[PDB]
Amino acid sequence: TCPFYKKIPGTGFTVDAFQYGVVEGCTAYFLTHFHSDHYAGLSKHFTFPVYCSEITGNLLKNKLHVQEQYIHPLPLDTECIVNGVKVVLLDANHCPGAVMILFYLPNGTVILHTGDFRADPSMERSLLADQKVHMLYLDTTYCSPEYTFPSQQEVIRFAINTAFEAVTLNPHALVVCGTYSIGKEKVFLAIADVLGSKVGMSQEKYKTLQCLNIPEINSLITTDMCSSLVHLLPMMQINFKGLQSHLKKCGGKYNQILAFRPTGWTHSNKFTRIADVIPQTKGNISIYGIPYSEHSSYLEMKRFVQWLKPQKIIPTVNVGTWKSRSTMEKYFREWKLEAGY
Ligand code: NI
């Protein structure tokens, strides 16, 4: 059955709760973003109302084939009414179309659900600042002090300079970026822009990108692999064997590959800075690991929560074991004692 952390008290609303069949009492199902864990169970066979951003609605319509009658897209930063209750969708700074939801309950309680988010100080000057938030449903993916990572902009700068140098040294080098879902598009778009190229990709991936309301998108991406010097492949193919194999397929138009694997955190965040990063190399193929994160680091998460000062925190990630929950509760109490709420 639907866990309590996916239910919004004193409404018949749920959030990211599509895998439990019909939820008893639920009149509106919210979807924060189009990542398979959160949408799990949604298909063309679903027949209840789904509330979401416009981008998330495009994806539901075109990729999952959910019938149009059940998709209720809402604009961002706008007070809207859903089944008699005031809501606001906010940018979550996660992947394209990802939202946080602010719920103003009839009794006067205010609840923020973050979805998946990368906390940022620009969130301290949104509609959130206008009133007290009593309960927070929090993306706790990286809720432990070891999880540090650079800014998105540091990582992009590094990727840009690396790619430009390599293709100026060898104009027959191909650049490859690994991918498995939406998110982290700035990586391949910024590399292509510095090389004066479109991004080449499969038909299914192009169809996904064509849903995301990216300005001038038709000038940036193509299905003609031949005509482009940046290619997207599945993350699973970003290894020496998969990359040599792809290079054979391109028809000797290229004689070298430089590849990037955007990952989350991995244990080499604890020593290295982004400027020290060096690739793994085998012959004419080099693979760079770059920690481009779309989740809050420990410090960004802590800052956001200490500003917000919620009366109760409800974790939404790593809640499956008591050890994890216990560990998280310890950090929440520390934050509260330091900040005086
Ligand atoms: Ni996500």
Curated annotation (Swiss-Prot):
Tissues with expression: Expressed in brain, heart, kidney, liver, pancreas, placenta and skeletal muscle.
A GO molecular-function descriptor: zinc ion binding
Keywords of this entry: Cell cycle, Cell division, DNA damage, DNA repair, Hydrolase, Isopeptide bond, Metal-binding, Mitosis, Nucleus, Phosphoprotein, Ubl conjugation, Zinc, Zinc-finger
Keyword Metal-binding: yes
One annotated Gene Ontology cellular component of this protein: fibrillar center
Entry's localization field: Nucleus
Any single GO BP term: cell division
Keyword Nucleus set for record: yes
Record's note on what induces expression: During mitosis. The mRNA encoding this protein contains an internal ribosome entry site (IRES) in its 5'-UTR. This 5'-UTR generally suppresses translation while specifically promoting expression during mitosis, when cap-dependent translation may be impaired.
Domain of life from the UniProt record: Eukaryota
Subunit structure: Binds constitutively to TP53BP1. Binds CDC27, which is itself a component of the anaphase promoting complex (APC). Binds PIAS1.
UniProt record similarity statement: Belongs to the DNA repair metallo-beta-lactamase (DRMBL) family.
Function: May be required for DNA interstrand cross-link repair. Also required for checkpoint mediated cell cycle arrest in early prophase in response to mitotic spindle poisons. Possesses beta-lactamase activity, catalyzing the hydrolysis of penicillin G and nitrocefin. Exhibits no activity towards other beta-lactam antibiotic classes including cephalosporins (cefotaxime) and carbapenems (imipenem).
Name the record gives this protein: DNA cross-link repair 1A protein
Species of the source: Homo sapiens (Human)
